[PDB]
Amino acid sequence: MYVKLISSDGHEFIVKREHALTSGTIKAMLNEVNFREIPSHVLSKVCMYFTYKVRYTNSSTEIPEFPIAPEIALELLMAANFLDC
Amino acid sequence: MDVFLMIRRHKTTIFTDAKESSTVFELKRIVEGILKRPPDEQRLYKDDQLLDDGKTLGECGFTSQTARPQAPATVGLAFRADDTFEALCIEPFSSPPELPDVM
Amino acid sequence: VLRSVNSREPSQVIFCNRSPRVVLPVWLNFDGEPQPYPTLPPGTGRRIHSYRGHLWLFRDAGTHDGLLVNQTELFVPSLNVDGQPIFANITLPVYTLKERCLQVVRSLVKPENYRRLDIVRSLYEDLEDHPNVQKDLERLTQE
Amino acid sequence: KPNYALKFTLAGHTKAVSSVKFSPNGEWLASSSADKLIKIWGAYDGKFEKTISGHKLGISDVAWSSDSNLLVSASDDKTLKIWDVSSGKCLKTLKGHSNYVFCCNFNPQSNLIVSGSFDESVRIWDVKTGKCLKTLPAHSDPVSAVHFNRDGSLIVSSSYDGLCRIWDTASGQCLKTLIDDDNPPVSFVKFSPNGKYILAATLDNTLKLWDYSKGKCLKTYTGHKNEKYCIFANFSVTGGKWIVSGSEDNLVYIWNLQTKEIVQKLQGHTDVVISTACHPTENIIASAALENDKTIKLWKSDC
């Protein structure tokens, strides 16, 4: 039902497995998975994207913007490029 | 109506959704299913406000507008420790690097 | 190609902007060339005068990010039997996390300083692979 | 009742003919065309008189001054031009609209020109200076027709936004908007000769006669085809009281103004009849057709 995604700095993020399968990487990598290179202020945002993606995919209720603060954009870009999501 | 939450204790964060009309007690059942501890051994919080088992999440201040999938609302979680409860303690996430010159 | 047909059959349309972006309607003329039209503020609507068989797409007006209209890429006013204006509901697509990340970076760094960045060199290409309407039109017609 | 029969076909334009207008003195017919030319013809014999040229793109409309000496024309090149008809020379080019100019008219005094454009504005111009005196934010969609009433005190405009609006010439103020529950594009509008009524065409195969003071519709005329082009219509007042209009089935339609029944249909054109005109003193109709025809026809009736 759930998986645990652990950041580089030890934070443990517990998310629905279906939500984690949003990332093609995580599908292959996968219960528990460590991300030695992704810190917690980035992994938490990745989990938010998982929630956002599953909630608003194939819905016609008005889609809001996914917000990304400037300070996290590059790492999130690298995380997203790594995660293939 | 769905609310979208982060239940946080120490270095643990649970991402879950719930109905605005569901109860604090029902949210503890979600936590129990994941972190083993029974509802009677849990204390849930909105900021520094202890939430009562019988209140709905809406009644505590978690609504569709304030608790969104791309910006979930935080629920603090504290466990029983021996004769009493541990203090509420949420470890902050890592800090972001300063903005490179290009920005 | 993908082009409007000179039907001369008038058709009223509501351009309804249910997105947070400033929207730029693009009409494909009778030679298939994109023509830009006045922009829509987010959360606003406008009744406009168009024609049956005329092709429209919708983009972010400052960045040319592609947008959805009635859950698809292209809008053509269809048969009207009730006399009401046809709704063109413009919405945000669910962008991939990567794509949305590219959008936010492009908005903060000028394209001169793209390669002045601490990122895997491969993503340099993705940053400068901007959305433009002509790129999609070749895409759309080759589908 | 009327018995219009074809007398002359005027050939010469090389594209769609957009507008025909009899000179107020009855001597001349001016025609405009998508071929960018204006032509002058004898009103009674059809004899070609001269060609007037200067516009850079096609022309939608042409209109005479009260004394039959000047013409104004409205062009896709975004200007109007004022022409001295006897010399064929362009006196002024009226610049200011930001898109196609579709319609034009002089006021009865012929010191002012009114114009309406795809750009949703109505502009009032000084004939002598060529300067724009007023830009009215008249509509929210293309303006299909503009017309001064009998004493020049009012302007009526029509638009694809569904409205007819009546404007005070001197102040520029909108005095009345003609609005109904259903609002199809208004493709043509004209004051009746006494200025009390307004004839409006809509792109649903309907012409309507509005009471200006009451702001209410009194008569409708149907049976013709009009869903695509802005077809020019007229009051025929020299014999019986008719309404005259072109039609997208290549016919000129003539209705009894009072009863609203069709009384004649004129066959002869080989494309959409987009312009009709009624002679000021004789029972003569001019009609003009689009690209598959390119001619003007003159028809005469005994009543």
Residue numbers in the entry:
A (entry chain K): 17 to 46, 58 to 112
B (entry chain J): 1 to 103
C (entry chain L): 62 to 204
D (entry chain A): 32 to 334
Extract from the study:
As anticipated, MS67 had VHL and WDR5 closer than in the MS33 ternary complex, resulting in a more extensive protein-protein interface. Several new hydrogen bonds were also present, including ones between the side chain of WDR5 Asp172 and the side chains of VHL Arg107 and Arg108. The methyl and t-butyl groups of the VHL-1–Me moiety were involved in hydrophobic contacts with Phe149, Pro173, and Tyr131 of WDR5, and conversely, the fluorobenzyl ring of the WDR5-binding moiety made van der Waals contacts with Tyr112 and His110 of VHL. Together, the more extensive VHL-WDR5 interface and the cross protein-ligand interaction were expected to increase the cooperativity of the WDR5-MS67-VCB complex.
The chromatin-associated WD40 repeat domain protein 5 (WDR5) acts as a functional subunit of the mixed lineage leukemia (MLL) histone methyltransferase complexes (1–3). WDR5 adopts a donut-shaped propeller structure, containing a WDR5 interaction (WIN) motif that binds MLL1, and another cleft known as the WDR5 binding motif (WBM) site that mediates protein-protein interactions (PPIs) with a diverse set of non-MLL partners such as c-MYC. PROTACs simultaneously bind the protein of interest (POI) and an E3 ligase such as von Hippel–Lindau (VHL) or cereblon (CRBN) and hijack the cellular ubiquitination-proteasome system, leading to selective polyubiquitination and subsequent degradation of the POI at the proteasome. Here, we present pharmacological degradation of WDR5 as a promising therapeutic strategy for treating WDR5-dependent tumors and report two high-resolution crystal structures of WDR5-degrader-E3 ligase ternary complexes.
